[PDB]
Design a protein around this ligand. Structure first.
Ligand SMILES: *[C@@H]1O[C@H](CO)[C@@H](O[C@@H]2O[C@H](CO)[C@@H](O)[C@H](O)[C@H]2NC(C)=O)[C@H](O)[C@H]1NC(C)=O
Ligand SMILES: *[C@@H]1O[C@H](CO)[C@@H](O[C@@H]2O[C@H](CO)[C@@H](O)[C@H](O)[C@H]2NC(C)=O)[C@H](O)[C@H]1NC(C)=O
Ligand SMILES: *[C@@H]1O[C@H](CO)[C@@H](O)[C@H](O)[C@H]1NC(C)=O
Lengths: 81, 49
């Protein structure tokens, strides 16, 4: 197999402050929906290129107007002084 | 129609790929005098020679 390097020598993990999605700290909602008119979230064809044409392609695309799921990464606790 | 149109070569020049074409043919024929001539339609003589 492939060597992943040395294992972690720390025998102690770090305590995390768990807050649910309705903890009035992560419910700030900026929607940002999928807009097809901007070609949002469009995966290009893998081995071809096209110029100055409009094509109907079957593939894997997001739905128009999809709000999606919003994830926020925060900063941990630290001392004021 | 999923046909090759252009190609980016290794020398740095873009090229246009077109299918190989043949010149059209028309034959004008006269039965009474038994004489005929050929017509290369819509193409100049410099492409014929
Ligand atoms: C950082 O991680 C990489 C990959 O997880 C480590 O690279 C491996 O190092 C071991 C030796 O300890 C080799 O046997 C592997 O072949 C390496 N893999 C790759 C993909 O490079 C690297 O050693 C780590 N560095 C530190 C400082 O921990
Ligand atoms: C990209 O495509 C458009 C439309 O297929 C081209 O616009 C045409 O240009 C010709 C020549 O000037 C006009 O006769 C047509 O009326 C135009 N059609 C439209 C709908 O505008 C355009 O020239 C193409 N661009 C390139 C760089 O090839
Ligand atoms: C999608 O993009 C177009 C062009 O950028 C814009 O006119 C339209 O308002 C956008 N859609 C929404 C819902 O804002």
């Amino acid at each position: 197999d492939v060597d992943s390097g040395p294992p972690s020598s720390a025998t102690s993990c770090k305590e995390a402050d768990m807050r649910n999605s309705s903890s009035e700290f992560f419910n700030k909602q900026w929607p940002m929906p999928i807009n097809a008119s901007k070609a949002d979230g469009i995966i290009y064809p893998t081995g071809k290129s096209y110029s100055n044409i409009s094509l109907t392609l079957q593939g894997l695309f997001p739905k128009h107007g999809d709000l999606g799921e919003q994830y926020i990464y925060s900063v941990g606790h630290s001392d004021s002084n | 129609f999923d046909n090759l149109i252009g190609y980016y070569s290794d020398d740095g020049n873009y090229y246009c790929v077109r299918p190989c074409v043949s010149v059209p043919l028309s034959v004008v024929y006269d039965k009474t005098t038994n004489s005929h001539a050929t017509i290369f339609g819509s193409v100049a003589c410099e492409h014929i020679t």
